[PDB]
Design an enzyme around this catalytic site. Structure first.
Site, mmCIF file in Angstrom:
data_model
loop_
_atom_site.group_PDB
_atom_site.id
_atom_site.type_symbol
_atom_site.label_atom_id
_atom_site.label_comp_id
_atom_site.label_asym_id
_atom_site.label_seq_id
_atom_site.Cartn_x
_atom_site.Cartn_y
_atom_site.Cartn_z
ATOM 1 N N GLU B 36 0.793 -0.970 -0.147
ATOM 2 C CA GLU B 36 0.002 -0.084 -0.032
ATOM 3 C C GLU B 36 0.664 1.379 -0.107
ATOM 4 O OE1 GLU B 36 -2.650 -0.518 3.313
ATOM 5 O OE2 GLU B 36 -3.334 -2.383 2.411
ATOM 6 N N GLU B 84 -2.554 -7.675 -3.247
ATOM 7 C CA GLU B 84 -1.770 -6.395 -3.030
ATOM 8 C C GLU B 84 -0.392 -6.582 -3.172
ATOM 9 O OE1 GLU B 84 -2.711 -4.248 0.614
ATOM 10 O OE2 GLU B 84 -4.820 -5.077 0.588
ATOM 11 N N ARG B 118 -11.131 -8.414 0.179
ATOM 12 C CA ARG B 118 -11.784 -7.465 1.020
ATOM 13 C C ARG B 118 -11.909 -6.023 0.516
ATOM 14 N NH1 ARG B 118 -6.480 -5.342 4.743
ATOM 15 N NH2 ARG B 118 -5.168 -4.781 2.737
ATOM 16 N N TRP B 160 -9.595 3.527 15.948
ATOM 17 C CA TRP B 160 -9.049 3.131 14.839
ATOM 18 C C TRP B 160 -9.744 3.217 13.468
ATOM 19 C CZ3 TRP B 160 -9.846 -0.527 18.654
ATOM 20 C CH2 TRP B 160 -10.388 -1.516 18.246
ATOM 21 N N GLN B 253 -1.003 2.914 10.467
ATOM 22 C CA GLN B 253 -0.503 2.920 8.770
ATOM 23 C C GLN B 253 -2.064 3.270 8.013
ATOM 24 O OE1 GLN B 253 -2.106 0.303 6.335
ATOM 25 N NE2 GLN B 253 -1.230 1.750 5.162
ATOM 26 N N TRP B 303 4.937 0.631 25.069
ATOM 27 C CA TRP B 303 4.656 -0.560 25.410
ATOM 28 C C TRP B 303 6.008 -1.366 25.762
ATOM 29 C CZ3 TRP B 303 1.083 -2.802 27.591
ATOM 30 C CH2 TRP B 303 0.661 -4.079 27.423
ATOM 31 N N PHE B 356 0.542 4.107 23.010
ATOM 32 C CA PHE B 356 1.366 3.068 22.495
ATOM 33 C C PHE B 356 2.556 3.802 21.859
ATOM 34 C CE2 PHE B 356 2.003 -0.531 19.142
ATOM 35 C CZ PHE B 356 2.377 -1.463 20.404
ATOM 36 N N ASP B 365 -4.374 4.430 25.520
ATOM 37 C CA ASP B 365 -5.029 3.282 25.737
ATOM 38 C C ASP B 365 -5.075 2.827 27.043
ATOM 39 O OD1 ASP B 365 -2.417 2.518 24.576
ATOM 40 O OD2 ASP B 365 -2.830 0.742 25.499
ATOM 41 N N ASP B 367 -4.426 -0.273 28.232
ATOM 42 C CA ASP B 367 -3.467 -1.117 28.328
ATOM 43 C C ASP B 367 -2.040 -0.245 28.888
ATOM 44 O OD1 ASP B 367 -2.863 -4.045 28.636
ATOM 45 O OD2 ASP B 367 -3.546 -4.333 26.561
ATOM 46 N N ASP B 368 -1.654 0.418 27.896
ATOM 47 C CA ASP B 368 -0.297 1.026 28.280
ATOM 48 C C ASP B 368 -0.226 1.967 29.490
ATOM 49 O OD1 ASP B 368 1.642 0.805 25.789
ATOM 50 O OD2 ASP B 368 -0.325 1.343 24.563
ATOM 51 N N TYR B 411 -9.333 1.887 23.955
ATOM 52 C CA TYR B 411 -9.319 3.328 24.056
ATOM 53 C C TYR B 411 -10.399 3.801 24.401
ATOM 54 C CZ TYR B 411 -5.456 2.107 20.929
ATOM 55 O OH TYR B 411 -4.391 1.768 20.263
ATOM 56 N N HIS B 442 -4.728 -6.827 32.969
ATOM 57 C CA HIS B 442 -3.580 -5.988 32.968
ATOM 58 C C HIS B 442 -3.865 -4.591 33.935
ATOM 59 C CE1 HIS B 442 -1.635 -7.047 29.060
ATOM 60 N NE2 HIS B 442 -1.582 -8.205 30.064
ATOM 61 N N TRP B 480 -5.656 -9.035 22.540
ATOM 62 C CA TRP B 480 -4.326 -8.348 21.840
ATOM 63 C C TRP B 480 -3.228 -9.394 21.906
ATOM 64 C CZ3 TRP B 480 -5.918 -3.895 19.348
ATOM 65 C CH2 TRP B 480 -7.000 -3.276 19.795
ATOM 66 N N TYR B 486 -2.271 -16.589 26.327
ATOM 67 C CA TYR B 486 -1.919 -15.189 26.329
ATOM 68 C C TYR B 486 -3.238 -14.699 27.429
ATOM 69 C CZ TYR B 486 -1.591 -10.251 25.916
ATOM 70 O OH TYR B 486 -1.604 -8.791 26.209
ATOM 71 N N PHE B 592 -6.366 -8.229 15.249
ATOM 72 C CA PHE B 592 -7.334 -8.477 14.990
ATOM 73 C C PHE B 592 -7.814 -9.938 14.891
ATOM 74 C CE2 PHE B 592 -7.546 -4.087 12.700
ATOM 75 C CZ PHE B 592 -8.076 -3.615 13.674
ATOM 76 N N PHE B 596 -5.817 -9.853 11.429
ATOM 77 C CA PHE B 596 -4.430 -9.166 11.424
ATOM 78 C C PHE B 596 -3.795 -9.492 12.872
ATOM 79 C CE2 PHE B 596 -1.875 -4.861 11.601
ATOM 80 C CZ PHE B 596 -1.731 -5.101 10.041
ATOM 81 N N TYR B 600 5.497 -9.015 18.143
ATOM 82 C CA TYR B 600 6.321 -7.987 19.095
ATOM 83 C C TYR B 600 7.611 -8.570 19.211
ATOM 84 C CZ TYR B 600 1.893 -5.773 19.966
ATOM 85 O OH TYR B 600 0.416 -5.457 20.165
HETATM 86 C C1 LIG Z 1 -1.241 -4.152 23.131
HETATM 87 C C2 LIG Z 1 -1.208 -3.071 24.151
HETATM 88 C C3 LIG Z 1 -1.575 -1.810 23.614
HETATM 89 N N1 LIG Z 1 -2.622 -1.844 22.434
HETATM 90 C C4 LIG Z 1 -4.090 -0.836 23.067
HETATM 91 C C5 LIG Z 1 -1.971 -1.051 21.233
HETATM 92 C C6 LIG Z 1 -1.808 -1.928 20.051
HETATM 93 C C7 LIG Z 1 -2.817 -1.956 19.017
HETATM 94 C C8 LIG Z 1 -1.956 -1.215 17.685
HETATM 95 C C9 LIG Z 1 -1.550 -2.252 16.706
HETATM 96 C C10 LIG Z 1 -2.566 -2.305 15.679
HETATM 97 O O1 LIG Z 1 -2.823 -1.108 14.732
HETATM 98 C C11 LIG Z 1 -3.677 -1.461 13.885
HETATM 99 C C12 LIG Z 1 -5.084 -0.593 13.916
HETATM 100 C C13 LIG Z 1 -5.950 -0.394 12.987
HETATM 101 C C14 LIG Z 1 -5.653 -1.472 11.707
HETATM 102 C C15 LIG Z 1 -6.564 -1.640 10.822
HETATM 103 C C16 LIG Z 1 -8.010 -0.992 10.452
HETATM 104 C C17 LIG Z 1 -9.112 -2.207 10.111
HETATM 105 C C18 LIG Z 1 -10.376 -1.701 10.170
HETATM 106 C C19 LIG Z 1 -10.853 -0.352 10.074
HETATM 107 BR BR1 LIG Z 1 -12.456 0.261 9.730
HETATM 108 C C20 LIG Z 1 -9.724 0.709 10.073
HETATM 109 C C21 LIG Z 1 -8.220 0.286 10.360
HETATM 110 N N2 LIG Z 1 -5.836 -2.459 9.819
HETATM 111 S S1 LIG Z 1 -4.485 -2.982 10.030
HETATM 112 C C22 LIG Z 1 -4.450 -1.800 11.626
HETATM 113 C C23 LIG Z 1 -3.235 -2.134 12.381
#
Ligand SMILES: C=CCN(C)CCCCCCOc1ccc2c(-c3ccc(Br)cc3)nsc2c1
Ligand SMILES: C=CCN(C)CCCCCCOc1ccc2c(-c3ccc(Br)cc3)nsc2c1
Ligand SMILES: CCCCCCCCOCCOCCOCCOCCO
Ligand SMILES: CCCCCCCCOCCOCCOCCOCCO
Lengths: 619, 619
Positions: B36, B84, B118, B160, B253, B303, B356, B365, B367-368, B411, B442, B480, B486, B592, B596, B600
């Site tokens: 991308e 892609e 997608r 996000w 990103q 983190w 983060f 967040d 978590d952090d 968040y 946490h 996560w 985990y 996700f 996704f 780390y």
């Molecule tokens: C683990 C402890 C602290 N966390 C708290 C922060 C870690 C989360 C950040 C890493 C993931 O970042 C992202 C965050 C969002 C995305 C999307 C995405 C998907 C759907 C939509 Br609608 C918009 C963006 N695609 S790829 C992607 C990556």
């Protein structure tokens, strides 16, 4: 005879040119720029002892015998300027005892103290807690709700005021206070028996605004102001959208500083706009050889380069000189191609103007555009494609900019509302941007080079405008230059270019006026006082630029081969320096009539060269 | 025995620490980030041949024997990713003939071609004119008009997604096309007989939305869309207000890239925000030793630093170790003190969380924050004032972030709407941000350090939430992190910390679950497939981190002095490298579930150290 002079002046300019191929002379004004910078740093809690020092020397170096500061060299002491400069010094370290602080304070008091200064001054002081916000003209964030076509909507103001108003609305909305340490408190600014002679609105104060303000100050005290939150956020968005490329707003000191304060107030010292906005500042700073540091009110790269070319061309160099090409190329990359605030009045007009500074795409001015296009029309660049193309875009933009009376304004069209001139706030300089003679002259002179004569309706409409505006004594007011010598020279030079007959009566009546003011030393001079007192119209110490202007009016009117004409040429030929340059201890530039004067560093070099080049033409 | 392992792991961590005193490991994901990036550069007309080359190496480097690319190492071939990655290569130079392009192409076709990918993928392709915008789920700028409490207002989406939606609305509003040269046209992506197996909305498609979309696509074709101009400006302003310090948006990103495209589309390539946003990119880039260049989906400085401290502390270093102080001090300067999007739900809550990445003040967040506060609560800093202060702010913020069910989100608060999960657009990963077990764990573990126990209502509410969510087999989902190992490890560790009795039934039922999944090699492993297929819960190749997690669950439940416990410790001691580090060729991080996955870099080092430190504690 003169050939040696021109020859010298030519080479000298060519040396002053930067590598990129542009010219850029420092823009002089007054110490309120530096004094306000000092307070700004204090507000933003970012004070650099080393910088403060350079600013101190500078401030002092500019103070006069009597212990005051004026708007222009040799000008009368200014209260506002002196007050701010005073506070600035006292904050840096100066003790109220020292000679400088003493003489300055005295003058301050003898004028009614702080109570007699412009709103800005009182406002700045209010910001540091040395003045009650309640006694400051209020400008509400809600102003952001007035529609495009409504009384006092931010678009009725002149480009420079508009941005300031938006920024301040946020500031005045919170009325923040950033306390000065006891050491710098300036209570003495009040200690005075002299009656406070306050300055009123520019065009007059109407009891309506006078009351409306009181209303706003009352509303300000309520516990809840519905939709104010949304009014602020509107001002914020508005500002965020127009932040110039260098991190400034509009490329001018005022709104830029206020905008930053506005951001700081909203806890946005972490936001990009602020950062960039802050670091952008350094570019406008200037290290003085005597250890001082001044801050430019604005910068004139484009302007200088533009005029610089024209001068050198009229002087003699080839339309394709490898050095002038550097300029030509540079200029082309500067052209603005995106909509700016002007679009609000001309939605179907294609972008093509130019700005005064390096990167300010939302505020191109008719003046720069005209000079830049015209200057380009006089060159032979490798890519005749872009040169041909750009000129057309610039040309058309200008055309579409012509106001209702055929006269051209600086930044906007028909920005002639007479409303904002009465607000209690607007008590300093201009607030609207109506057409002026000098600008319209530079426009006509632009088309003229292409060949468009008096036949074309556009041209005529303008000429009519100029004829109507001419003064009884055949002179023409100088809006962005000091003054009648500047305007008159501009007009006559333009009219001569648009085919008009230089033999006409009104024309001759102008030329005679020129000859009648030629100083004994051969040159011409017009002191800034000519804005306040008419007795000075065309009067004042002779200067290179002002002389070169009157000289153009004569060369244009055919009187090139005359006494006064040759006499003046002599002055330039003599006064010139061994290096080819010229000195000019006075200001020949105007920010606002009677309120803000500028000194264009290049003028003393460029204009004399342009005049001589044109004299060598008539022969 | 293990002692030498710890000493080595420690000295290794301390070496990986930067000068400023923080830790920062690269965040791994998949090639869609780089692919991308390539298209983005093409859109913005800013292609660097050299960079394209480094990117090409990487892409190929990541391609597997079968010629495809997966989401995680050892994962099945992914259509979207491969597509892609395919287009990216073909644009860089690769000819559809080359073997790599060959194998890839056949896989893609065998899946139904472009029609089975997608929305994002089809959209990106739409952007370059290789796919009809009409066949792309529409997201209107008008969405910006939905009020705070309305169905589908941008605040019902996860932080996000929200930013991405706003940015895309502008893009989909103009449906721009940035044509690829004929050389890179990818028509072959359509050539296929296989039935297009399209992916639907995350939580099911309602005929309503399906209809509404078609409705929006039709409206899109009209000649006039009243108030759309305002809609766009609403979206732009929304973006300009939240741009992060490094110039990105949210520090991720997705919206970052789209936001820049949105600015291009609006002729703002020379506006501060655009410039910064563009040059901000480099920070997320990473030079790979083999000549490649990858782009981080996001960065985890905070983190890492946070966990790094905790590990080292549990390991042995003094609460005042001059090295951990560097971290302590650093962390303190990172705390966020201004309102963020979370404020919309908690106006009276005081800012105090952490982010983060390095500079992202609008999106801290839970978590952090928990980890950062807790970590600090274990150090002895020179300025006990700030340390005490910061902890309170952070702590209190956390308390005020707790959702209705007592669980904690990433968040936002109660971001549990089920509406956005049905929009035709949202067909990738999560779109809302509801409370999760791991996060809440946490949080509890954080308060635990302070001494707060099951007595405090806040904690009980949480424990209740956790008890209710527990899985039939006594395990706990990993939101996560990958996955049940985990989560379970997180919970048990937390509950043990909040005073809860580790002897409880539900607790024991969890521990047993852990001992039952221990691999023959002694360690524990859980493949990402455990998100798709349950037969993979707790199953997978052993990894340092995952092992260290199960190990914590055991040490916490008192079973520290056990067989499986000691067995696992052995694995870590043996598998360790000569430098004290550890290898981990798999992903143990989750972006996700099922869509996704992240790797780390620090986990393989930090967690094993933390586990050993805790083992050495139980003795
Ligand atoms: C683990 C402890 C602290 N966390 C708290 C922060 C870690 C989360 C950040 C890493 C993931 O970042 C992202 C965050 C969002 C995305 C999307 C995405 C998907 C759907 C939509 Br609608 C918009 C963006 N695609 S790829 C992607 C990556
Ligand atoms: C001459 C050719 C091209 N011109 C076209 C550009 C030259 C004009 C720019 C220099 C003046 O800049 C400013 C412009 C504005 C100000 C104000 C000011 C005054 C009142 C309000 Br209300 C707000 C700002 N105070 S000081 C000041 C300086
Ligand atoms: C947001 C739509 C982009 C189209 C821009 C035209 C907007 C109308 O111009 C009215 C004049 O106001 C000046 C605007 O230019 C300033 C930049 O703000 C960014 C929006 O383009
Ligand atoms: C303009 C009012 C200033 C008061 C700030 C409170 C912020 C409003 O909170 C609502 C939630 O939105 C979170 C904002 O983060 C965005 C930054 O924009 C800056 C506004 O100050």
């Amino acid at each position: 005879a003169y050939a040696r002079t021109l020859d010298r002046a030519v080479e000298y300019l060519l040396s002053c040119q930067k590598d990129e191929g542009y010219w850029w002379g420092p823009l002089l004004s007054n110490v309120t720029m530096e004094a306000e910078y000092v307070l700004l740093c204090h507000i933003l809690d970012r004070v650099d002892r080393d910088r403060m020092e350079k600013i101190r020397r500078y401030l002092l170096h500019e103070q006069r015998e009597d212990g005051t500061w004026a708007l222009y060299p040799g000008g009368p002491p200014d209260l506002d300027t002196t007050i701010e400069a005073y506070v600035a010094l006292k904050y840096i370290g100066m003790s109220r005892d020292e000679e400088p602080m003493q003489k300055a304070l005295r003058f301050i008091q003898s004028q009614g103290g702080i109570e007699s200064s412009r709103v800005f001054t009182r406002m700045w002081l209010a910001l540091v807690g040395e003045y009650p916000w309640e006694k400051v003209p209020m400008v509400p964030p809600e102003i952001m709700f007035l529609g495009k076509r409504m009384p006092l909507n931010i678009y009725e103001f002149g480009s420079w005021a508009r941005a300031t108003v938006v920024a301040l609305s946020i500031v005045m909305s919170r009325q923040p206070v950033f306390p000065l340490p006891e050491r710098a408190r300036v209570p003495e600014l009040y200690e005075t028996d002299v009656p406070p002679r306050r300055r009123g609105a520019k065009g007059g104060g109407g009891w309506i605004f006078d009351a409306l303000d009181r209303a706003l100050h009352g509303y300000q005290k309520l516990s809840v102001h519905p939709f104010r939150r949304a009014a602020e956020i509107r001002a914020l968005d508005w500002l965020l959208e127009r932040q110039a490329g260098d991190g400034s707003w509009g490329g001018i000191q005022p709104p830029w500083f206020y905008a930053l304060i506005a951001l700081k107030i909203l806890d946005m010292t972490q936001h990009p706009a602020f950062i960039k906005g802050w670091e952008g500042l350094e570019l406008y700073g200037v290290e003085l050889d005597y250890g001082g540091w001044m801050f430019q009110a604005s910068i004139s790269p484009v302007w200088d380069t533009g005029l610089a070319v024209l001068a050198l061309r009229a002087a003699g160099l080839p339309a394709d000189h490898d050095r002038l090409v550097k300029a030509g190329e540079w200029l082309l990359d500067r052209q603005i191609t995106v909509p700016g605030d002007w679009a609000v009045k001309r939605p179907n007009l294609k972008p093509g103007g130019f700005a005064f500074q390096f990167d300010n795409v939302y505020y191109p001015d008719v003046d720069d555009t005209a000079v830049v296009v015209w200057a380009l029309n006089t060159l032979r660049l490798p890519d005749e494609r872009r040169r041909r193309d750009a000129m057309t875009k610039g040309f058309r933009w200008i055309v579409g900019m012509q106001s209702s009376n055929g006269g051209w304004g600086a930044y906007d069209v028909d920005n002639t509302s007479d409303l904002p001139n009465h607000i209690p706030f607007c008590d300093f300089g201009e607030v609207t941007d109506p057409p002026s003679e000098d600008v319209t002259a530079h426009v006509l002179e632009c088309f003229g080079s292409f060949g468009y004569d008096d036949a074309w309706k556009v041209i005529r409409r303008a000429v009519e405008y100029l004829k109507r505006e001419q003064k009884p004594d055949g002179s023409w007011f100088g809006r962005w230059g000091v003054n009648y010598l500047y305007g008159t020279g501009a007009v006559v030079s333009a009219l001569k270019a648009v085919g008009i007959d230089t033999r006409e009566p009104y024309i001759q009546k102008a030329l005679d006026w020129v000859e009648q003011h030629q100083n004994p030393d051969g040159g011409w001079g017009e002191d800034c006082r000519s804005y306040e007192d008419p007795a000075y119209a065309g009067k004042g110490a002779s200067t290179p630029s002002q002389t070169a202007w009157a000289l153009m009016a004569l060369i244009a009117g055919g009187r090139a081969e005359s006494e006064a004409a040759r006499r003046g040429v002599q002055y330039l030929v003599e006064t010139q320096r061994p290096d080819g340059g010229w000195d000019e201890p006075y200001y020949t530039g105007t920010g606002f009539p009677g309120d803000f004067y500028l000194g264009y560093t290049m003028y003393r070099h460029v204009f004399p060269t342009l005049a001589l080049g044109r004299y060598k033409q008539a022969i």
